[PDB]
């Protein structure tokens, strides 16, 4: 146990074990040899000072020990010559996601082993390497991990409702929250009050510009006929009937309500905890209806296709501002067909509803 260039007797942990040749060099001689090789000699002269030692990944391993036992100015020239004489560009520096160690990696493979934690990771997505990722894109791999994380599927449809964010229509801030039972949403960043289902504005007192509105002196909004503001009053069975008639599948069984809400604190995360009835996919009643309405909105299903005459007359006075009147010779089917025809032609679905 002694330095191979000066003979100084030191323990093994007092010297530097050169990885390429395992010739132990004391700290001072290791330092002084490699600076004069950088100061007066060329990059090819960075050979070991003890032994004799075209695979030049030796610079990647030497860069580690050079970073430790060298001055910053001398370590800067080593990088300068490495790019000005070997690489014609900066070296690719990789950070290990599991141990936070930085190292130069200039190899062929997509997998890279950390010289510290000795774990292998993909150079693109920086996730830990597995045999499943071989031959697959990183997008395919991390989705296979999400499709195999027991704690992720245990949350159930709560993750689906949170994936559908609430985007503020004016400040565009994204909130990874479920809409819940109440449609009113106040954005912390811009103080905008809007409906979380149709993204229309909640007008204050005497600020509503819509014509023929009879509640202008009150806080309110105007919602399309397919917004959750209205479809929340439908029963789960009738919401499912609109889905079944268009061959849209929906969950009834799970594949307190675990849908994450926000708790007011001097905001904390808190589960819904409401009763999860049978046939509601383990969700709350309001959160299950939100789940069905999102399916309805995604496929742009028209709830007016299930309207009866009284509902069609209410919709005609609301969105067309004309009290309908049956014409002579019409039966209930014809009167219903005419009102449904005019509504679907003149009043579209939610133009701002997230689909």
């Amino acid at each position, epitope marked *: 146990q002694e330095c191979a260039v000066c003979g100084w007797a030191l323990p093994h942990n007092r010297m530097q074990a050169l990885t390429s040749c395992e010739c132990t060099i004391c700290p001072d001689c290791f330092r002084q040899h490699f600076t004069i090789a950088l100061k007066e000699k060329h990059i090819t002269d960075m050979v070991c000072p003890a032994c004799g030692r075209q695979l030049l990944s030796y610079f990647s391993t030497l860069d580690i020990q050079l970073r430790e036992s060298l001055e910053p100015d001398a370590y800067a020239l080593f990088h300068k010559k490495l790019t000005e004489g070997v690489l014609m560009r900066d070296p690719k520096f990789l*950070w290990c*996601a*599991q*141990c*936070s160690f*930085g190292f130069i990696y200039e190899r062929e493979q997509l997998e890279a082993t950390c010289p510290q*934690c000795h774990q292998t990771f993909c150079v693109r997505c920086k996730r830990q390497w597995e045999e499943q990722h071989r031959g697959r894109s990183c997008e395919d791999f991390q989705n296979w991990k999400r499709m195999n994380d027991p704690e992720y599927q245990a949350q159930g449809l709560a993750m689906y409702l949170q994936e559908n964010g609430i985007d503020c229509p004016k400040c565009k801030f994204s909130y990874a929250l479920a809409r819940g039972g109440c449609m009113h949403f106040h954005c912390t960043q811009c103080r905008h009050q809007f409906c979380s289902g149709c993204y229309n504005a909640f007008y204050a007192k005497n600020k509503c510009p819509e014509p023929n509105c009879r509640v202008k002196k009150s806080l309110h909004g105007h919602h399309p006929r397919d917004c959750l503001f209205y479809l929340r009053d439908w029963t789960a069975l009738r919401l499912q009937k609109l889905l079944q008639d268009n061959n849209v599948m929906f969950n009834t069984e799970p594949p307190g309500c675990r849908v994450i809400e926000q708790k007011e604190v001097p905001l904390r995360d808190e589960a819904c905890g409401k009763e999860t009835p049978a046939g509601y996919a383990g969700l709350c009643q309001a959160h299950y209806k939100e789940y069905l309405v999102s399916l309805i909105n995604a496929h742009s299903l028209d709830p007016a296709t299930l309207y009866e005459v009284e509902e069609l007359e209410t919709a005609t006075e609301r969105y067309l501002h004309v009290r309908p009147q049956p014409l002579a010779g019409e039966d209930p089917p014809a009167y219903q067909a005419r009102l449904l025809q005019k509504l679907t032609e003149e009043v579209p679905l939610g133009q701002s509803i997230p689909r």
Partner: nanobody
Amino acid sequence: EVQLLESGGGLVQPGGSLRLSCAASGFTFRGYSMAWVRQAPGKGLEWVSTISPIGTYTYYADSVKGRFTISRDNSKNTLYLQMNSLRAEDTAVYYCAKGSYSRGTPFDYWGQGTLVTVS
């Protein structure tokens, strides 16, 4: 959004004990490595320790390898750092970092930090 809230720093005589916390939110805590870093007055940022996602692996700097102990609680979404036998050169602002899977950095988020002084 992502938020890291450190707490537990203050004044403590040399040789004492101090336990720091870092409550995390806005991301899957159990899926990322966490770490502690510090910055002494008039000096550069220094890495202290890093812990693996579920806690099977811990890495420490040579100056704190046996004196400090990093730990996490995925059920509580909080990272801990137990500091024992604090020396004079431990006075620094302590940040908790969130490991990143993005190219170009080992961490993508740092907290506000807590000041720690030793007498």
